[PDB]
Ligand binder design. Structure first.
Ligand code: AAX
Length: 266
């Protein structure tokens, strides 16, 4: 039932030059787009394109309409355009983030980190930017449901973006009640913070994720502090992992709090 304003979003297929595959997101490729922001520039973009069942067409067209509905924020992966007219493949064009995902990136910097190279400023800043992106998504009345460092991408000038399009990340009430809400995303955000301050480690190191893990989780067991955390950042993880979803901070409160930690750090 959502509209598609072709005047606003439609981009000519002949001004898109196919480049290197990114993978399977729908095939996701790099492309060079001329004029996509109306200036006389060539820009690398990310394209999702259809290989074609009606179900798959519908899913991609629905993605397109949701990205439109959501709108623009610096800390999400934004829609730039689409190719929907008959006579070529259905394509959805979004911002390209040249450094890839945050988990793989931080792992690559394990020996290129000093607290004060990545520094604490960088990690708190990534953390702050994600919270701002999530605060935006919550205001558009979305729930993410896989908020994890692998779904954050790093673009130029340390801008991080949530891919807006996983038991170790799930809130206890989601595991046990099937419930996904914005407060359950706050729990995931705490896991993501741990991912950031472990420099891209896997959560719950060397823990079998089974009925006993879920038991200990309902009972109050939490991850220990990761190796590159500040005490304040671990406190924030614990806050996000409150057993009562209503006692977790909101994304707005995290943006305030992390903003203060970012400024205190400087
Ligand atoms: C060198 O750049 C990268 C290297 C690796 C990644 S990745 O680590 O996220 N793996 C991508 C694979 C396809 C799932 C991401 C990027 N950069 C990037 N920029 C944008 C996207 C991206 C990644 C997945 C899906 C979509 C997309 C594109 C269009 C419509 N909807 C979704 C875009 O990825």
């Amino acid at each position: 039932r959502l509209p598609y304003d072709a005047s606003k979003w439609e981009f000519p297929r002949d001004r898109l030059k196919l480049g290197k595959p990114l993978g399977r997101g729908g095939q996701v490729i790099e492309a060079d787009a001329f004029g996509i922001d109306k200036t006389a520039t060539c820009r690398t973009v990310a394209v999702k394109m259809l290989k074609a069942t009606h179900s798959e067409h519908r899913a991609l067209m629905s993605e397109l309409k949701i990205l439109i509905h959501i709108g623009h924020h610096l800390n999400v992966v934004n829609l730039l355009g689409a190719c929907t007219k008959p006579g070529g493949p259905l394509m959805v064009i979004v911002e390209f983030c040249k450094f890839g995902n945050l988990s793989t990136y931080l792992r690559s910097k394990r020996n290129e980190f000093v607290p004060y190279f990545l520094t604490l400023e960088h990690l708190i800043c990534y953390s702050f930017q994600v919270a701002k992106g999530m605060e935006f998504l919550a205001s558009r009345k979305c729930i993410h449901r896989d908020l994890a460092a692998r779904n954050i991408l790093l673009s130029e000038k340390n801008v991080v973006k949530i891919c807006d399009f996983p038991l170790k990340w799930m809130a206890p009430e989601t595991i046990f009640d099937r419930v996904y809400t914005i407060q359950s995303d706050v729990w995931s955000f705490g896991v993501l913070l741990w991912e950031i301050f472990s420099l891209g480690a896997s959560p719950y190191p060397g823990v079998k994720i089974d009925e006993e893990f879920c038991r200990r989780l309902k009972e109050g067991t939490r991850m220990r502090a990761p190796d590159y955390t500040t005490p304040e950042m671990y406190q924030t993880m614990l806050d996000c992992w409150h057993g009562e979803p209503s006692q977790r901070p909101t994304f707005s409160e995290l943006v305030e709090h992390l903003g203060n930690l970012l400024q205190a750090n400087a």
